[PDB]
Amino acid sequence: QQCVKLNDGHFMPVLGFGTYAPPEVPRSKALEVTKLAIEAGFRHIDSAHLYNNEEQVGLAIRSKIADGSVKREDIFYTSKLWSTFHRPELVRPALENSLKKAQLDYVDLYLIHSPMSLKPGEELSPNGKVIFDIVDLCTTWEAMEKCKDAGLAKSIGVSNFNRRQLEMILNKPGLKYKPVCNQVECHPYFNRSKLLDFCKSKDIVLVAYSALGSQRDKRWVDPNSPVLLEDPVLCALAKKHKRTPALIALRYQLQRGVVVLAKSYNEQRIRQNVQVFEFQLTAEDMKAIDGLDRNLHYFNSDSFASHPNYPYSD
Numbered sequence: 001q002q003c004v005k006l007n008d009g010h011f012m013p014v015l016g017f018g019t020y021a022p023p024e025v026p027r028s029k030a031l032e033v034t035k036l037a038i039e040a041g042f043r044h045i046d047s048a049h050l051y052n053n054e055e056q057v058g059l060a061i062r063s064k065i066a067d068g069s070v071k072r073e074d075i076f077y078t079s080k081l082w083s084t085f086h087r088p089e090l091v092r093p094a095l096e097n098s099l100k101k102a103q104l105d106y107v108d109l110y111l112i113h114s115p116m117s118l119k120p121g122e123e124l125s126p127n128g129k130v131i132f133d134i135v136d137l138c139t140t141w142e143a144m145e146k147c148k149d150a151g152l153a154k155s156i157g158v159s160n161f162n163r164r165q166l167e168m169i170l171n172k173p174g175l176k177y178k179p180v181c182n183q184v185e186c187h188p189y190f191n192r193s194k195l196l197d198f199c200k201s202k203d204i205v206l207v208a209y210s211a212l213g214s215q216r217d218k219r220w221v222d223p224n225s226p227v228l229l230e231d232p233v234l235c236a237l238a239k240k241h242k243r244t245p246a247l248i249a250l251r252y253q254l255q256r257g258v259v260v261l262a263k264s265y266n267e268q269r270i271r272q273n274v275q276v277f278e279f280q281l282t283a284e285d286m287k288a289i290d291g292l293d294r295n296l297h298y299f300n301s302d303s304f305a306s307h308p309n310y311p312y313s314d
């Protein structure tokens with residue numbers, strides 16, 4: 001619990017535990033590994049409606065409160081509004097359902113998961129098609145603000161927004177709350193320098209996902225893409241500091257003022273990842289890592305690259 005202060009006065013731990021696992025992984029695993037994460041020292045826990053794991057992640061949190069390991073106030077829990085629920089009337093009900101699943105009174109953070117609105121319904125991916133929806137995200141934002149005012153979410157933010165999409169929210173007439181963060185794909189191959197500079201200028205925290213190079217799911221990621229953790233510069237730095245390529249990638253983010261997530265469903269790696277606070281990179285190390293930037297977003301599929309609100313300029 002190194003934390004940063006958000007623009008609404010709440011505090012966010014700078015290291016977060018990623019809870020997504022693909023559908024093939026048994027649901028019970030999320031319970032086990034979230035408990036391990038809390039035991040290792042993670043306090044920021046990142047979930048979402050999309051993950052089909054809120055019940056398990058919520059149970060892990062409740063279990064660690066029950067056994068006296070943590071208090072609710074010690075945990076920073078995030079969920080996310082899925083893209084089929086962007087229409088304003090659907091936002092509060094979506095959050096309420098997430099709270100019901102997790103058996104929590106509030107989330108610390110609620111995000112718009114993606115700007116890519118989808119046809120309303122209970123299909124995660126609505127043939128089918130994929131079926132897109134055209135929704136003014138400023139209206140979705142107004143509904144998010146009402147969720148904060150109701151006490152359902154302590155803080156509200158966005159995810160996968162580009163600068164223009166963020167700007168549209170920031171310059172909305174009658175804006176009540178700025179997004180506290182923008183959670184985006186961010187790692188040495190896609191370091192988001194310009195977006196980071198923008199976010200900092202607006203008191204918006206950038207939160208990095210796929211900071212370790214993603215789970216390389218064949219549905220969304222080209223197997224040909226270079227494997228981040230196999231990068232020779234990261235490996236050389238790991239050797240230099242007697243750490244691991246994953247630790248180098250995580251430390252890089254912290255030193256740029258980026259809040260970083262790390263998913264692992266492996267006990268040893270969960271414990272390893274908290275070691276990010278135990279060492280430093282020099283200016284020259286950071287420059288070497290900056291040199292890796294190559295405009296590689298691992299999530300790169302036809303299923304969304306043609307969405308009218310797809311955030312990347314490809």
Ligand SMILES: NC(=O)c1ccc[n+]([C@@H]2O[C@H](COP(=O)([O-])OP(=O)(O)OC[C@H]3O[C@@H](n4cnc5c(N)ncnc54)[C@H](OP(=O)(O)O)[C@@H]3O)[C@@H](O)[C@H]2O)c1
Pocket residue numbers: 017018019020021046047113114159160183184208209210211212213214215229244246247261262263264265266269270272273
């Ligand atoms: N907002 C969004 O649209 C969005 C998108 C993607 C991700 N996220 C969030 O960000 C989280 C993390 O991103 P991600 O899922 O792409 O995964 P990631 O954090 O980039 O991790 C990728 C892989 O690295 C491995 N790993 C973890 N620690 C390691 C270590 N110390 N050494 C070697 N390998 C290690 C993990 O495998 P093992 O499990 O086998 O250890 C994991 O599958 C997600 O779980 C989710 O919470 C959000």
Ligand SMILES: CC1(C)CC[C@@]2(CC[C@H]3[C@@H]4CCc5cc(C(N)=O)ccc5[C@H]4CC[C@@]32C)OC1=O
Pocket residue numbers: 050113114115116124125159160220299300304310311
């Ligand atoms: C930046 C992009 C365009 C990248 C793709 C991404 C980041 C992670 C992606 C998901 C990755 C997981 C996922 C799962 C299902 C499912 N039905 O299980 C359906 C869709 C998705 C993907 C939708 C697009 C997601 C939300 O969002 C975005 O906004």
